[PDB]
Design a protein around this ligand. Structure first.
Ligand SMILES: N[C@@H](Cc1ccc(O)cc1)C(=O)O
Ligand SMILES: [Cl-]
Ligand SMILES: [Cl-]
Ligand SMILES: [Cl-]
Ligand SMILES: [Cl-]
Length: 185
Protein backbone atom coordinates (compact mmCIF):
# COMPACT_ATOMS: atom_id res chain seq x y z
CA UNK A 1 0.00 0.00 0.00
CA UNK A 2 1.17 3.51 -0.81
CA UNK A 3 0.05 7.09 -0.88
CA UNK A 4 -3.23 7.60 -2.62
CA UNK A 5 -4.56 4.08 -2.07
CA UNK A 6 -7.98 3.40 -0.57
CA UNK A 7 -8.34 3.05 3.19
CA UNK A 8 -11.56 2.05 4.96
CA UNK A 9 -12.75 2.95 8.47
CA UNK A 10 -15.85 1.54 10.17
CA UNK A 11 -17.87 4.17 8.34
CA UNK A 12 -16.36 4.85 4.91
CA UNK A 13 -13.51 5.27 2.52
CA UNK A 14 -10.71 7.80 2.37
CA UNK A 15 -7.19 7.79 0.94
CA UNK A 16 -3.81 7.08 2.49
CA UNK A 17 -1.67 10.22 2.56
CA UNK A 18 1.93 9.19 3.16
CA UNK A 19 3.61 6.28 4.86
CA UNK A 20 5.74 7.58 7.74
CA UNK A 21 7.77 6.24 10.63
CA UNK A 22 9.61 6.90 13.86
CA UNK A 23 12.36 4.41 14.00
CA UNK A 24 11.03 0.99 12.93
CA UNK A 25 7.45 1.95 14.05
CA UNK A 26 5.38 2.54 10.93
CA UNK A 27 2.31 4.67 10.49
CA UNK A 28 0.42 6.50 7.78
CA UNK A 29 -0.91 10.03 7.66
CA UNK A 30 -4.38 10.88 6.38
CA UNK A 31 -6.95 13.65 6.93
CA UNK A 32 -8.06 14.44 10.45
CA UNK A 33 -11.69 14.57 9.41
CA UNK A 34 -11.23 10.93 8.35
CA UNK A 35 -9.57 9.80 11.58
CA UNK A 36 -12.07 11.66 13.77
CA UNK A 37 -14.25 8.96 15.32
CA UNK A 38 -12.40 6.11 13.58
CA UNK A 39 -10.69 3.16 15.24
CA UNK A 40 -9.63 0.32 12.92
CA UNK A 41 -8.64 0.85 9.29
CA UNK A 42 -8.75 -1.77 6.56
CA UNK A 43 -7.28 -2.00 3.04
CA UNK A 44 -10.39 -3.38 1.38
CA UNK A 45 -14.10 -2.67 1.25
CA UNK A 46 -14.85 -6.14 2.55
CA UNK A 47 -12.88 -5.12 5.75
CA UNK A 48 -10.88 -8.31 5.98
CA UNK A 49 -7.33 -6.94 5.48
CA UNK A 50 -6.54 -4.90 8.58
CA UNK A 51 -4.11 -2.02 8.26
CA UNK A 52 -4.04 -0.64 11.79
CA UNK A 53 -5.59 1.67 14.34
CA UNK A 54 -6.19 5.39 14.56
CA UNK A 55 -3.57 6.95 16.77
CA UNK A 56 -4.17 10.69 16.38
CA UNK A 57 -6.55 13.21 14.86
CA UNK A 58 -6.44 16.99 14.56
CA UNK A 59 -9.63 18.36 12.97
CA UNK A 60 -10.94 21.07 12.80
CA UNK A 61 -8.34 23.90 13.03
CA UNK A 62 -5.98 21.55 11.28
CA UNK A 63 -6.86 18.59 9.05
CA UNK A 64 -4.44 15.73 9.74
CA UNK A 65 -4.39 12.40 11.52
CA UNK A 66 -2.26 9.31 11.93
CA UNK A 67 -2.84 5.53 11.88
CA UNK A 68 -0.50 3.00 13.50
CA UNK A 69 0.08 -0.09 11.42
CA UNK A 70 -0.76 -3.42 13.06
CA UNK A 71 -0.36 -5.53 9.92
CA UNK A 72 3.27 -6.62 9.80
CA UNK A 73 3.18 -8.28 6.35
CA UNK A 74 1.58 -5.75 4.05
CA UNK A 75 4.09 -3.74 2.05
CA UNK A 76 4.27 -0.12 3.24
CA UNK A 77 5.89 1.59 0.33
CA UNK A 78 7.46 5.01 0.87
CA UNK A 79 5.90 6.24 -2.37
CA UNK A 80 2.78 7.77 -3.92
CA UNK A 81 1.94 5.08 -6.44
CA UNK A 82 4.99 5.02 -8.77
CA UNK A 83 6.45 8.28 -7.42
CA UNK A 84 9.30 7.79 -5.01
CA UNK A 85 8.95 9.99 -1.88
CA UNK A 86 12.11 10.96 0.03
CA UNK A 87 11.44 14.19 1.93
CA UNK A 88 8.87 16.82 2.82
CA UNK A 89 8.70 20.44 1.67
CA UNK A 90 6.52 23.49 1.90
CA UNK A 91 4.27 24.82 -0.86
CA UNK A 92 4.81 28.16 -2.56
CA UNK A 93 2.40 30.17 -4.73
CA UNK A 94 2.66 29.04 -8.37
CA UNK A 95 4.21 25.66 -7.50
CA UNK A 96 3.29 22.73 -9.73
CA UNK A 97 1.79 19.99 -7.54
CA UNK A 98 0.14 16.59 -7.97
CA UNK A 99 -2.55 14.83 -5.92
CA UNK A 100 -3.36 11.11 -5.82
CA UNK A 101 -6.55 9.68 -4.34
CA UNK A 102 -8.67 6.59 -4.36
CA UNK A 103 -11.73 8.04 -6.12
CA UNK A 104 -10.10 9.96 -8.97
CA UNK A 105 -6.47 8.80 -9.23
CA UNK A 106 -3.69 11.25 -10.11
CA UNK A 107 -4.34 14.88 -11.02
CA UNK A 108 -2.05 17.87 -11.29
CA UNK A 109 -2.29 21.65 -11.05
CA UNK A 110 -0.82 24.61 -9.22
CA UNK A 111 -0.79 26.26 -5.82
CA UNK A 112 -2.91 29.41 -5.99
CA UNK A 113 -2.72 30.63 -2.33
CA UNK A 114 -1.18 29.80 1.00
CA UNK A 115 -2.58 30.12 4.53
CA UNK A 116 -6.18 29.72 3.33
CA UNK A 117 -9.09 29.32 5.71
CA UNK A 118 -11.92 26.94 4.88
CA UNK A 119 -15.24 26.91 6.73
CA UNK A 120 -16.85 23.49 6.28
CA UNK A 121 -19.78 24.49 8.48
CA UNK A 122 -20.88 23.24 11.84
CA UNK A 123 -17.90 24.76 13.58
CA UNK A 124 -15.45 22.92 11.33
CA UNK A 125 -13.16 25.79 10.33
CA UNK A 126 -9.62 24.90 9.24
CA UNK A 127 -6.73 27.32 8.84
CA UNK A 128 -3.32 27.38 7.21
CA UNK A 129 -4.34 25.49 4.07
CA UNK A 130 -2.74 25.27 0.67
CA UNK A 131 -5.24 26.35 -2.02
CA UNK A 132 -4.91 24.84 -5.50
CA UNK A 133 -6.72 24.46 -8.79
CA UNK A 134 -6.37 20.66 -8.54
CA UNK A 135 -9.69 18.79 -8.55
CA UNK A 136 -10.80 16.15 -6.02
CA UNK A 137 -13.93 14.15 -5.16
CA UNK A 138 -15.34 12.42 -2.07
CA UNK A 139 -13.05 9.56 -1.05
CA UNK A 140 -9.90 11.43 -2.14
CA UNK A 141 -9.68 13.02 1.30
CA UNK A 142 -6.43 12.33 3.09
CA UNK A 143 -4.52 11.56 -0.07
CA UNK A 144 -1.13 13.05 -0.84
CA UNK A 145 -0.16 16.29 -2.51
CA UNK A 146 3.40 15.98 -3.77
CA UNK A 147 5.88 17.48 -6.19
CA UNK A 148 8.57 15.13 -7.41
CA UNK A 149 10.07 13.34 -4.40
CA UNK A 150 8.66 15.89 -1.96
CA UNK A 151 5.63 15.30 0.26
CA UNK A 152 3.71 18.58 0.47
CA UNK A 153 0.11 18.14 1.68
CA UNK A 154 -2.88 16.05 2.67
CA UNK A 155 -6.23 16.43 0.85
CA UNK A 156 -8.74 18.25 3.04
CA UNK A 157 -11.65 19.44 0.91
CA UNK A 158 -12.92 21.84 -1.63
CA UNK A 159 -15.37 22.38 -4.45
CA UNK A 160 -16.06 20.99 -7.92
CA UNK A 161 -14.99 17.64 -9.32
CA UNK A 162 -12.55 16.02 -11.75
CA UNK A 163 -14.96 16.03 -14.70
CA UNK A 164 -15.74 19.78 -14.79
CA UNK A 165 -12.88 21.07 -12.63
CA UNK A 166 -12.45 22.17 -9.08
CA UNK A 167 -10.56 23.83 -6.24
CA UNK A 168 -8.95 21.76 -3.52
CA UNK A 169 -7.38 22.68 -0.20
CA UNK A 170 -4.57 20.73 1.44
CA UNK A 171 -3.17 20.51 4.94
CA UNK A 172 0.61 21.14 4.92
CA UNK A 173 2.23 17.83 5.65
CA UNK A 174 5.18 19.39 7.48
CA UNK A 175 2.84 20.39 10.32
CA UNK A 176 1.67 16.82 10.80
CA UNK A 177 5.22 15.43 10.66
CA UNK A 178 6.34 17.92 13.32
CA UNK A 179 3.26 17.42 15.51
CA UNK A 180 3.85 13.67 15.74
CA UNK A 181 7.63 13.57 15.41
CA UNK A 182 7.51 11.23 12.43
CA UNK A 183 9.21 11.28 9.03
CA UNK A 184 8.40 10.30 5.48
CA UNK A 185 10.56 7.59 3.95
N1 LIG B 1 -14.30 15.78 1.39
C1 LIG B 1 -13.79 14.70 0.60
C2 LIG B 1 -12.65 15.25 -0.30
C3 LIG B 1 -13.19 16.21 -1.31
C4 LIG B 1 -12.33 17.04 -1.99
C5 LIG B 1 -12.75 17.99 -2.95
C6 LIG B 1 -13.98 18.05 -3.33
O1 LIG B 1 -14.60 18.87 -4.36
C7 LIG B 1 -14.88 17.11 -2.64
C8 LIG B 1 -14.44 16.17 -1.68
C9 LIG B 1 -13.25 13.57 1.51
O2 LIG B 1 -13.71 13.45 2.90
O3 LIG B 1 -13.27 12.23 1.08
CL1 LIG C 1 -16.11 2.88 -1.27
CL1 LIG D 1 13.58 7.94 12.59
CL1 LIG E 1 8.32 -2.50 7.39
CL1 LIG F 1 12.14 16.10 -6.44
Amino acid sequence: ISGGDAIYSSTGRCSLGFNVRSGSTYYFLTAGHCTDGATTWWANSARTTVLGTTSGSSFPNNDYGIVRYTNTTIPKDGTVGGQDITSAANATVGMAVTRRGSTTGTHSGSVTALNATVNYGGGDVVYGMIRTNVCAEPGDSGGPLYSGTRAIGLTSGGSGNCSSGGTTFFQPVTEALSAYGVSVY
